[PDB]
From Swiss-Prot, chains A, D:
Ni(2+) binds at residues 78, 89, 91, 97. Belongs to the transcriptional regulatory CopG/NikR family. It holds the Pfam family NikR_C. InterPro entries: Acetolactate_synth/TF_NikR_C, ACT-like_dom_sf, Arc_rbn_hlx_hlx, CopG, CopG/NikR_regulator, Ni_resp_reg_NikR, Ribbon_hlx_hlx, TF_NikR_Ni-bd_C. Binds 1 nickel ion per subunit. Transcriptional regulator. This is Putative nickel-responsive regulator. One of its GO terms (molecular function) is DNA-binding transcription factor activity. The lineage of its organism: Archaea, Methanobacteriati, Methanobacteriota, Thermococci, Thermococcales. Keywords: DNA-binding, Metal-binding, Nickel, Transcription, Transcription regulation. It comes from the Archaea. It comes from Pyrococcus horikoshii (strain ATCC 700860 / DSM 12428 / JCM 9974 / NBRC 100139 / OT-3). HAMAP family: NikR.
From Swiss-Prot, chains B, C:
HAMAP family: NikR (MF_00476). Keywords: DNA-binding, Metal-binding, Nickel, Transcription, Transcription regulation. It comes from Pyrococcus horikoshii (strain ATCC 700860 / DSM 12428 / JCM 9974 / NBRC 100139 / OT-3). Belongs to the transcriptional regulatory CopG/NikR family. It holds the Pfam family NikR_C. This is Putative nickel-responsive regulator. The lineage of its organism: Archaea, Methanobacteriati, Methanobacteriota, Thermococci, Thermococcales. Its cofactor is Ni(2+). It comes from the Archaea. The keyword Repeat does not apply. Ni(2+) binds at residues 78, 89, 91, 97. Disulfide bonds: none annotated.
Length: 138, 136, 136, 138
């Protein structure tokens, strides 16, 4: 392990606004928040360049009684057995379901999976979260 | 004063990767890049959400062997039994875990809960997704 | 009459496997084996559970392309929003899915809910696990 | 597809008790219930002989604040990344957690995993459910 210390200059008003926000959110300090920003930036780049394995979640909401969304979802997912690990389903109300799908694999593959799921007519709301396997981070 | 100068300490591996990336992008120095990361962060954390009823997911990744993240995560979650429905956990490798927490409640409280989770020491990365179970 | 004779139809693949197994065990005929399976079933479904508060899991496996199991499963689950907390789903192969439903409520109602799920046409196999969140 | 029809003789009182039970449970008919029994019997045998892949779930309940059960559980599970697919956790009350682990792999391996998890001091209740990948059934 090796820690590298360096200085940076940030616009004063920007910094002031930043400190006010992270405190409200709950961060213990500015250094921790900035390191978090740097990790986030690196994770995003990981989804852009390379073929390294990434991980993510796809959250969707739908009415299971509407059309054939339920069948369509299953068929799409079973087509990607290698990337989809598992999914959590919560029955919101008599008609609405919330489902979150955990995926692991190549970035381009996962983004296509999200495209197909989110573009389904029955899917009302949805969002792909791009994150990491943590293997290459800390 | 227009600029405030201060120092920060970062693991070398993490800094090497950061330097490589910002060099490719064409940034002239670390301060420009971090300034931009800070601005984007402020913008994302300024958007209003309201107080309606929302259902969401909080995705997080961490090394379960680091500090006390595992204990902190549980204690924090067990404080909000009413909003936290369930959580899914996937063991990525020997040390890393990915967890997805499903929540429901008033947008205001959900956002606050997510902030505490995502800012816990030990959490390497994470994102909140809030949605209204209503119509598209 | 001591014995009641009746017929049943079974896919040949399933029957071949059954025949192979009971032959190894030393059963003389299919009726002896099925008689034993029926007796064990009655015994397991006669044990009392009470009416205390329990938390459980219902594990099921099915071919999502068979009949209307997927629709039936959802409709049935959405009728008991109060007892069903969440469900985990794992896509085993092109057709088969494994699902685990977490429930909480009065032992009596939980057992009844599990029975309806496990007896739905299309469900290949499944088991209920009830426990009291109390002390060992 | 081929259906084979055959007759069987069951003790009359046993059969009567059986019909009464399956109706109460919700089965549409005796044939369906018996085929279910046969599938169950085959699945159990699958866990006894062979090396064929099986699937199961391990349900446990524990107080996360008690001793080191939480850390012990994670360490054990991360030791079997190949068999454990994912897990669902529900916070029961301020102190008690309910967790269900989905596993897939060889029978002997999964039973050992259950042994280790269930034998933990902090685990108050628990049960391994032996089921199938469905691949070899219908
Ligand atoms: Cl400063
Ligand atoms: Cl008859
Ligand atoms: Ni299908
Ligand atoms: Ni649902
Ligand atoms: Ni992979
Ligand atoms: Ni606690
Ligand atoms: Ni883990
Ligand atoms: Ni942090
Ligand atoms: Ni419905
Ligand atoms: Ni599936
Ligand atoms: Ni059946
Ligand atoms: Ni560990
Ligand atoms: Ni818990
Ligand atoms: Ni395997």
């Amino acid at each position: 392990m090796e820690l590298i210390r360096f200085s940076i200059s940030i616009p004063s008003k920007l910094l002031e606004k930043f400190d006010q926000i992270i405190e409200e959110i709950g961060y213990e300090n500015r250094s921790e928040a900035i390191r978090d920003l740097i990790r986030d930036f690196i994770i995003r780049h990981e989804w852009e360049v390379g073929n390294e394995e990434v991980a993510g979640t796809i959250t969707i909401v739908y009415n299971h009684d509407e059309g054939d969304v339920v069948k369509a979802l299953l068929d799409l997912q079973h087509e990607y057995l290698d990337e989809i690990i598992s999914s959590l389903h919560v029955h919101m109300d008599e008609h609405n379901c919330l489902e979150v799908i955990v995926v692991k694999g190549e970035a381009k593959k996962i983004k296509m999976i999200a495209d197909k799921l989110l573009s389904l007519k029955g899917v009302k709301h949805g969002k792909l979260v791009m994150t990491s396997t943590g293997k290459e981070l800390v």
